[PDB]
Known about the structure:
The protein is an alpha+beta fold. It has helices spanning 6-10, 34-42, 64-67, 77-83, 127-143, 160-169, 181-184, 186-194, 231-254, 266-273, 289-293, 309-317, 325-332, 337-349, 365-375, 407-432, 467-485, and strands at 26-31, 51-55, 58-62, 88-91, 93-96, 102-103, 122-125, 147-151, 154-158, 174-176, 179-180, 218-219, 258-263, 280-283, 393-398, 434-446, 452-458, 496-508. It binds a DNA duplex (11 and 13 nucleotides) through residues 55-58, 60, 74, 92, 123-124, 126, 130, 150-154, 304-310, 359, 387, 391-398, 440, 442, 452, 454-458, 496, 498, 500. It catalyses: DNA(n) + a 2'-deoxyribonucleoside 5'-triphosphate = DNA(n+1) + diphosphate.
Amino acid sequence: MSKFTWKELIQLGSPSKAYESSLACIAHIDMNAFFAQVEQMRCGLSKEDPVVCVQWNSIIAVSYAARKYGISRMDTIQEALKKCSNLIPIHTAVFKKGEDFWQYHDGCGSWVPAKQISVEDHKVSLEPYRRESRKALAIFKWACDLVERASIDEVFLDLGRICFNMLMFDNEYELTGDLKLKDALSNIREAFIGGNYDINSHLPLIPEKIKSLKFEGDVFNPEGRDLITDWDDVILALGSQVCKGIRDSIKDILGYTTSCGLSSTKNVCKLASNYKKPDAQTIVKNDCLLDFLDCGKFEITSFWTLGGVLGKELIDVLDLPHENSIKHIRETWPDNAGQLKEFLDAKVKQSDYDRSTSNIDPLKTADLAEKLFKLSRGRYGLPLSSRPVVKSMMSNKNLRGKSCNSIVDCISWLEVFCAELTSRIQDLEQEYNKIVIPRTVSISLKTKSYEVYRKSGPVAYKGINFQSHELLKVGIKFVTDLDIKGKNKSYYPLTKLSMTITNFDIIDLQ
DNA sequence: GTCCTCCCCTC
DNA sequence: TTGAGGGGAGGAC
Ligand SMILES: Nc1ncnc2c1ncn2[C@H]1C[C@H](O)[C@@H](COP(=O)(O)OP(=O)(O)OP(=O)(O)O)O1
Ligand SMILES: [Mg+2]
Ligand SMILES: [Mg+2]
């Protein structure tokens, strides 16, 4: 019989539990060369124009046209110009200190007179990118009932309902000119409509006729395994068809190309979306999970949450090798996560451990073992969270020279931050029909000696027309407080100043 | 009980 | 890098 149960299939129809099914169909979609594509589209340029988006002197995004020249993100604009004479460098929008609005200064930059965009007198605006991100999000949410915005240019989609409904109910989809999906799937549809199945019983064996169903995109398959051999493959393939449709809506409506990863889990999807770019969809079958994870590109540190100090501690505590760490984890504790838990409990129970400088929770070693056991097999299923309209907003200026050399300069930059945040808040209120209320503000700064000073606390609310004022009041309070705390110590000129609204109330309207 | 400060993760 | 942003522990209040 199938490896899968009626329970696992039917749970694809539940947004709260679909992710947990071995039959899950998740997509990760990442915008290609995002900031460069935004600038390309704003300036009416083409896929063939070698655009790079520039922030001060750094390339922050490189179009795929420009990458054909050898240009890489974080190249300096100087280096980029050597590699491509026809380069189209476009600087981010900016705010000018003393003004309360952002705009593009096209024709201006550190390349190029009276046309330089100085780091002393401006701050970056990323708002054109954020706007375009929210447009994309609207398109994704219209196509799919569960979408997680993972970062400015990434989303995850849970395709469970679309796949389930297509599998059971779609009477138009054609596999071939002589074969409809409804007829290929007559046995399973009969059983489902007949309703006479046990939720804990295994599914029938896939019908031979469903093997005509095609995947849309690149199926990762170096070992040449059979494409459709169980119901997970049927769902994944249907999912790839729908995902292509969604990605085409993004391309047709907004102009943006995407790369996409399709698999049963978020973690594998995120790896897969980065496998092939631009404008591509990489599909990882369950039976190809180990082939993919072990291709040589990935280590335990490639997994989300494991890319920093915890990951490095795990390499040391689990005596992981420098390469093929994923396979190592899998083969060293091959049967169950408890084997790994036992190993962890031993290392951590030792009196010479150091529990105050470790990122492993000794009380939660069952969860860590299960996470590593499953990640190493490509079967660690995390839920998608639908995020609120906004959670936090930051306005940040890293400062050069003496552009912030006294409390007067601090406040001058705070006025830019306050104007920016207020305009961002108004835009969200109009776009999403909400009242958006800052509740808590944090000021963070760095001295000339790079020492960090922070202060957070409540901000009062008196409506949108007084919002900038209410933010500034608290900011001025906090910067003057911190000035006192820095007396007789290395302080001015500052090397960084930022204001973040760290907590919002969101009121629904209509 | 919640708040503030400090910290870790990611693009 | 800079300029974002997500999240949580634990002592302060
Ligand atoms: N370290 C960073 N600092 C500031 N901005 C960044 C940084 N990394 C990425 N970005 C911005 C610019 C990118 O266009 C956007 C999305 O990031 P990312 O997906 O990593 O690259 P990308 O979309 O430019 O290229 P790709 O086609 O490889 O996805 O976020
Ligand atoms: Mg991208
Ligand atoms: Mg990204």
